[PDB]
């Protein structure tokens, strides 16, 4: 598991790259994957920069914090731009949660430094909404 | 919902006060409420500074990020101090996720400020583990 600020930010950046791709370059494919008629789905970003739409972890509590559940249940109930922004904010939050789960043993100043690396990047919400 | 940095951090601080209380002053009762025989349970901190152990949101995706699910399924399989530290880190991550959910529309400087306010308070993990 990532431990240092640098290891955690490398992991963060790879998962974020995956989620950004799902929400922009691959958006039609991602949208189709989030079928409202499937069971409840989550969007994951993995440290090999792959994204994944799937059921949540079968066994709980999971090893890592979980992404928002059932995003496919919201897809057809709002405009596409609003659904993508909803997925984006929850994904931003998941990225932060995973990073500071790994970073639980960092001291105050190292946690601050980790956030400064994260905060130099546009959020997924920023990108998808065109801020 | 909270929207300014001040409003979001007031909300954070109250939810944190609730979860700190669950993990310290009220820890015996909190531990006993995480009944392994019950369905999957979560620890919530509310903006009126009260804590609650309950089932997750019935309808998904929930309005707010959700706390870690099924912490009662982990209680008897670990030593108490290790279970409490696990709940603590997941609770720290949930507090951060909730605040930056509300803070989706904050700018880069405001996000930095919000994290600096959060980061200056001892984490639940550090309180529980004595770090």
């Amino acid at each position: 598991s990532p431990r240092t600020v640098e290891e955690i930010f490398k992991d963060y950046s790879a998962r974020r790259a995956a989620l950004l791709r799902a929400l922009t370059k691959d958006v039609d494919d991602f949208y189709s994957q989030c079928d409202p008629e499937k069971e409840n789905l989550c969007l994951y970003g993995h440290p090999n920069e792959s994204w994944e739409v799937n059921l949540p972890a079968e066994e709980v509590p999971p090893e890592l914090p979980e992404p928002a559940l059932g995003i496919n249940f919201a897809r057809d109930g709002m405009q596409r731009k609003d659904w993508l922004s909803l997925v984006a904010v929850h994904s931003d939050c998941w990225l932060l949660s995973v990073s500071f789960y790994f970073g639980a043993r960092l001291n105050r100043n190292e946690r601050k430094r980790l956030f400064s690396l994260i905060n130099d990047l546009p959020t997924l919400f920023d990108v998808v909404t065109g801020r | 919902s909270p929207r300014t940095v001040e409003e979001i951090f007031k909300d954070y601080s109250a939810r944190r006060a609730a979860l700190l209380r669950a993990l310290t002053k009220d820890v015996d009762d909190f531990y006993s409420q995480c009944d392994p025989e019950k369905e999957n349970l979560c620890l919530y901190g509310h903006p009126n500074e009260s804590w609650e152990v309950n089932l997750p949101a019935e309808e998904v995706p929930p309005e707010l990020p959700e706390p870690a699910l099924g912490i009662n399924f982990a209680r008897d399989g670990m030593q108490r101090k290790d279970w409490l530290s696990l709940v603590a880190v997941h609770s720290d991550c949930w507090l951060l996720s909730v605040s930056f959910y509300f803070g989706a529309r904050l700018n880069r400087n405001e996000r930095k400020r919000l994290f600096s306010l959060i980061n200056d308070l001892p984490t639940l993990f550090d309180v529980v583990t004595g770090r």
Partner: peptide, 9 residues
């Protein structure tokens, strides 16, 4: 329509 619905069984 709906923003959410019950979690899957």
């Amino acid at each position: 329509q709906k923003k959410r619905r019950k979690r899957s069984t």
